[PDB]
Each structure stands twice: as structure tokens, then as C-alpha cells.
Amino acid sequence: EFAMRYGVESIYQAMTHFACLSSKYMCPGVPAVMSTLLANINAYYAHTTASTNVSASDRFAASNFGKERFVKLLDQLHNSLRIDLSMYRNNFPASSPERLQDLKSTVDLLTSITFFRMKVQELQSPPRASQVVKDCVKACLNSTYEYIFNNCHELYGREYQTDPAKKGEVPPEEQGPSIKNLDFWSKLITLIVSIIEEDKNSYTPCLNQFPQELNVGKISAEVMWSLFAQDMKYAMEEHDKHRLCKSADYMNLHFKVKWLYNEYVA
């Protein structure tokens, strides 16, 4: 009634409410609403009346919300989405399906923004959503890799160890690499597997928007193996100097690495 009495067009109301929602975008379901809302704001400026001789970007420059304002709003939001997606595992734990759906809709919103940049702003080279997300996933995977690589024993102890007395806080240098024993690496491999599987199983189905460009399980395997492989390569070089573990242990590690590689990487 305020809007109808005072001539405020529906698209202004929407771009305003989208601006409100953009502050609360972390909140459950909001990214779906925002994605939908932006697909509508998009459809409004993009498609409405082909009988016009004006670009979608110029018709959008005739927005009473302000083109600039909405462009900036979308950029800030896109950045906030990039940040949260750069910790997607932590910020959208697999133990919450709804947070996985918010993750999905967070990406669907990022797509809707990129699509709005492409269609309404008529931008010639918007940062491709699939790529933006892939980078976020890489950033998260790096931070994940660091996390597991710092917390290896706690994580492994808890998740796989059949004797409870071994589940606890073994030293940071064994929740990280040791020259005396390979056990960190064995445990790290199983955690890398657990992460790759979580990515394959939870996050890849969740993030199916760009199936031909984004497979989270592939990216997880690639990054996790890469990080692991650099580290493992330095570590094996280091073990090759010291030779403190037995021949057999490196053979067992070799079998595990072979298996890991051949299962997920080959």
C-alpha cells in the first residue's frame, strides 16, 4: 500500500528487498530466495519488451534503484559468497543437509549474479561462476589440507582407530610429519580419502550446477593429492636421507600411496 499509493515500482521494491537479504545472506534458505529474486530482477531488465531499441544495461541504467548501487551491492555480495565458499566445508558442514542446501543455493545465487552481470550488465568477461567457485573450493581445500595436516592424529584416532586409547592428542609433530615413523602419512592418507569421499559424496552432488566444469570430488582429489604429493615428496626425500623407518614400512606406504593414487588420482 505504501508502494502502490506512492508510485514505487515493483522492481524497485525487489532490488531494495534483495539489498536487505544481501546482509542476511548467510541465514537459512536466503540464498535460494535471493537467487530467485535476482533471476526475476534479471528477467525484468534482460527480457522485458524486445520492441525497445535499448541494451539491457541501458534499460538497467534507467533503474530508479540506481544501476551503480545494485552493481556494487552484487559485487559485495559476490565477494561475501566467495569468502564463505572459500571455507565451504566449515561454513556448510556435511552433517547439516540444510547447510548443504544453503551452500547449493549460495552457488545458485553466485550463478544468478554472474548471469546478471552477463545478461543485464552485458559484461564481456564476468568472473565465470564455475571458476569462481572452483577457486573457492581450492581455497577451502587448501585450508582443509592445512587443518587435517595439523590435526591428523586427533581426526584419525577418532574416526578409524579400533582401540579408544589411541583416539587422543598425539603430538602436533605426529598430527603432522615425523621422520621416525610413517604413521602420520598413513593416517593423513585415510583423512585425505575421508575428505575426498566427503567431497565426492556430499559436496559433488550438492555442487552439480556446472557438471561439465565443476566436480568437487575431482577437484578435491587433485588438490589434496597435489598438496599431499608435494609434501610426501619432500618427506620421502627426507626419509631417504635419514632411513630411520624400515624398508618394509616404505613398501607398505608405497602400497598405500599406490592404492590412493590408483583409486582417486590415476
Binding site: 578409524y160 582407530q161 579400533t162 582401540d163 579408544p164 586409547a165 589411541k166 583416539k167 615413523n181 604413521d183 585415510t190 580419502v193 624400515k246 618394509a248 614400512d249 607398505n252 592404492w259
Partner: protein, 443 residues
């Protein structure tokens, strides 16, 4: 800056002069003097904070301030050391006390079938058990609570609490002679466990000691005492003494994680191929074990060698299940091939990480006895990832263990009528009958 050095030099030289004589005052006739010296030390810290603040506190020069903050931490640590040195002069008395508490608790057993001086109430037995230490504690803690400043008292009490908890753990709950009397070979006695009644009594003596050390808030916070790792460790050891056979066995498999990372001084090896099947027909777990061969068996014997390979599964809930298989024997063959495939069932409930294969090579000997050549452990946690594994298990002479394996084992050996415990204890207590290639391994 110049003056902060003066302060530091003087006050550390005080702290030092005191610290040097401190132990000489920690003798039983002068208990007050250590308390007073601790209070002096602490009074230095207090007067130093005053003096730091009088020197402008936050507005003091950075190196002068740094000097005095350093000094305050050093002095704090002196007070901690003095508190420890003080608490330590009570250690022999705490040990004597706790040994007496142990002499009293030996007279309490599983008393629902014992006379009313030991089926005396759980409370009265706890009080009797406690009496040696409560003569010490009541008097001393009430004296210290007076003559120690509250910072001094708390530090003294933490050092005494730890000392009591550890002494009780060592002297009462895990007495080294219970290695001898049913972990070890020394006596065919049932050892007598900590019986439910002596588990109680102790758990109540401990709540009383905790209340004593709490002293209605005058001593240590209930929160420090409950979170006390010393207490938690003591409670853990106690919890083991009543735990069910399967739970003890699960605990063994989950804790003995190192029984799956290289035998030291091997006596041969066994090639196995193993397939965990999260049984595609049931969602139980079944364990196929293809015994391929053995090799390098250190058993060039005084006769016809006739090796066969026993395979055993180990873990919880196996009473209803075939725990053992064996290959055929092979005549005169230190590298016998078998190619024999066995199929254990695990439980449905307990995951593969609750289980381990134990692979034993034995010489078949009619008229005599089938000599253990060697033993290997494979942890099925590994196979929980691997699904199927080819592996050459090195064979040992005995399985290598930690304190908790050895504690669980000495606990299970007291369950000397439980058939699962009997067979578990027997199975872990199997070692290579030494001969034809050697007695004791490495871990």
C-alpha cells in the same frame, strides 16, 4: 630502568637465599617455617605489584616494566617450586599412608560374602581405609589453611592432591606386584581383583579426599578436582577392574593399535591375502583370509618340521563364532605354501577396527605338543580402508603390549572361569615355544 634492576636483584637475592635454605626447613618439626617462607615469597609478589603500580604501573618505562613483569613471573615460579619442595617433604608420609590405606583395603574384599567388619558399610570401610591419610590431611590442611596465605595454600594443595592421587593410583589401584600375581607367571592365584566392594570404598575414599582437598571451598575448586587428570587416570584404572569381558577385549583391540606396525626380531613371515567383505549378502562383516604361504620360518628343528598355520580372529562378541582355523601341515618345509582360504565372521555390531587377526605358525607334533613357531597381528582397521590386502606378515615370538594391554590382560586373567576371557588370555599369552630358532622378540 636503573631502579627496576635494583628491585630485581634484591628481590631475587631474597627469593634465592630463602629457596636455598627452604628444603632444610621442610623437616617435620618446622612445617610453619616453609609456610612462612612461601608467604614471604608471596608477600614479595604482592609488594612488588604494589611497587610496580607505585612505579606508575602501565605508565612505567617499557624495559623497567619488562624487568618487573619478568621478576613477577620468576617469583611466581619460585613460589611454585617452594610449594612443590614443601609438598614433596610429605611424599614419604603420603606413600606410607597410602600403603597403610592399601593394607587396610586388602582386608575388605567382595564383602557381600565376608564378615561385618569388612561387609562393614561402604562408608565405614572408606573411613577405615582413609584413616592413615586423614590423620595427616585434617591436621596439616587445617594448619596450612591458617598459616599459608591463600595463594600459598592453593599451590601447596595442588602439589599435595596430585601426590595423593598418583600415590593412590600407583600404590593401591595398580600395585606392581599385580604384574607378578596374574599378569605374570609367578603365582596360580586368582590375584583377587579390586572387588565391587573394594571399587566402592575406594571411589568413596576418593570422593572424601576430594571433599577434603575442596575443604568447603577453602581448598581446591571441585572443578579442578573433577577435571584432575590424576583423578581421571585413577578413575580409568578403577573402571577397568569391573568392565565386561567383551568391553575389556574391545578396549584391548582399540588400545593395542601398535600390534599392527612391524614385528621386531621376526621368526619368519606369512603371505596372506585378506578380503574384508562387509558381507554383500548381509551387511555383517565376514573376513576371508587366503593363507598363501609362510617363508623364513626360524625353525630348523631337531626332527621332522611339519608347519601349519593357525589363523585366529580377535575382537568383541566372538563366543558364538569359530575363532580359529588352521591350514593343513606341510612336511619339512621352512617356506610352506598353503593357498587355503578361511572365512571368519565378525559381529554385526562392532566395526572392523574392533578386530584383529592373529596368525600363528605351529609345528604339527603328534605324541609331543604342536610347537608355536611364531605369531603375527593384523589390525582390521587397515582393511576397513583397504577392502582387500595382500600382505607379508612378519612373525614374532610374543605379541608386544602397552600398560593397558597388560592391565586388561591381568584383569581378564582374573575372570578365570569366563571361557571367552580364558581363550582370549590363552590366545594373547601364546608365545613361540622358543626352540629351533629362539625365545624372546622385540616390540
Amino acid at each position: 630502568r636503573r631502579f627496576a634492576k635494583t628491585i630485581s636483584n634484591v628481590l631475587l637475592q631474597y627469593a634465592d637465599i630463602v629457596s636455598k635454605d627452604f628444603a632444610s626447613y621442610c623437616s617435620k618439626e618446622k612445617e610453619k617455617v616453609p609456610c612462612i617462607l612461601m608467604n614471604n615469597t608471596q608477600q614479595l609478589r604482592v609488594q612488588l605489584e604494589k611497587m610496580f603500580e607505585a612505579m606508575g604501573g602501565k605508565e612505567l618505562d617499557a624495559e623497567a616494566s619488562g624487568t618487573l613483569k619478568e621478576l613477577q613471573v620468576k617469583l611466581n615460579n619460585v613460589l611454585d617450586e617452594l610449594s612443590h619442595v614443601f609438598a614433596t617433604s610429605f611424599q614419604p608420609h603420603i606413600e606410607e599412608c597410602v600403603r597403610q590405606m592399601g593394607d587396610i583395603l586388602s582386608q575388605v574384599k567382595g564383602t557381600g560374602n565376608v564378615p561385618a567388619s569388612a561387609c562393614s558399610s561402604v562408608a565405614q570401610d572408606a573411613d577405615n581405609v582413609l584413616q592413615p591419610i586423614m590423620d595427616l590431611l585434617d591436621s596439616n590442611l587445617t594448619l596450612f589453611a591458617k598459616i599459608c596465605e591463600k595463594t600459598v595454600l592453593k599451590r601447596v594443595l595442588k602439589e599435595l592432591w596430585k601426590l595423593v592421587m598418583n600415590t593412590m593410583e600407583r600404590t593401591i589401584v595398580l600395585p606392581p606386584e599385580f604384574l607378578s600375581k596374574l599378569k605374570d607367571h609367578m603365582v596360580r592365584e586368582e590375584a583377587k581383583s579390586l572387588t565391587p566392594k573394594q571399587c566402592a570404598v575406594v571411589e568413596l575414599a576418593l570422593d572424601t579426599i576430594k571433599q577434603y582437598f575442596h575443604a568447603g571451598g577453602v581448598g581446591l575448586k571441585k572443578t579442578f578436582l573433577e577435571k584432575s587428570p590424576d583423578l581421571q587416570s585413577l578413575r580409568y584404572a578403577l573402571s577397568l577392574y569391573t568392565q565386561a569381558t567383551d568391553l575389556l577385549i574391545k578396549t584391548f583391540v582399540q588400545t593395542q593399535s601398535a600390534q599392527g606396525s612391524g614385528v621386531e626380531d621376526p621368526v619368519g613371515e606369512v603371505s596372506v591375502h585378506v578380503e574384508l567383505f562387509t558381507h554383500p549378502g548381509t551387511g555383517e562383516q565376514k573376513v576371508t583370509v587366503k593363507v598363501v604361504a609362510a617363508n623364513d620360518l626360524k625353525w630348523q628343528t631337531s626332527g621332522i618340521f611339519r608347519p601349519f598355520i593357525e589363523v585366529n580372529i580377535v575382537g568383541p562378541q566372538l563366543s558364538d563364532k569359530k575363532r580359529k582355523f588352521a591350514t593343513k601341515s606341510k612336511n619339512n618345509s621352512w617356506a610352506p605354501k598353503y593357498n587355503e582360504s578361511f572365512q571368519f565372521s565378525l559381529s554385526a555390531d562392532a566395526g572392523p577396527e574392533c578386530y584383529e587377526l592373529q596368525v600363528c605358525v605351529k609345528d604339527y607334533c603328534f605324541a609331543r605338543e604342536d610347537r608355536t613357531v611364531g605369531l603375527a597381528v593384523l589390525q582390521l582397521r587397515e582393511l576397513a580402508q583397504r577392502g582387500s590386502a595382500a600382505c607379508w606378515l612378519p612373525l614374532g615370538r610374543r605379541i608386544h603390549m602397552d600398560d593397558t594391554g597388560l592391565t586388561v590382560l591381568r584383569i581378564l586373567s582374573q575372570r578365570s572361569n569366563d571361557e571367552v576371557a580364558k581363550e582370549f588370555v590363552k590366545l594373547k599369552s601364546d608365545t613361540r615355544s622358543a626352540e629351533e630358532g629362539g625365545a624372546a622378540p622385540a616390540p
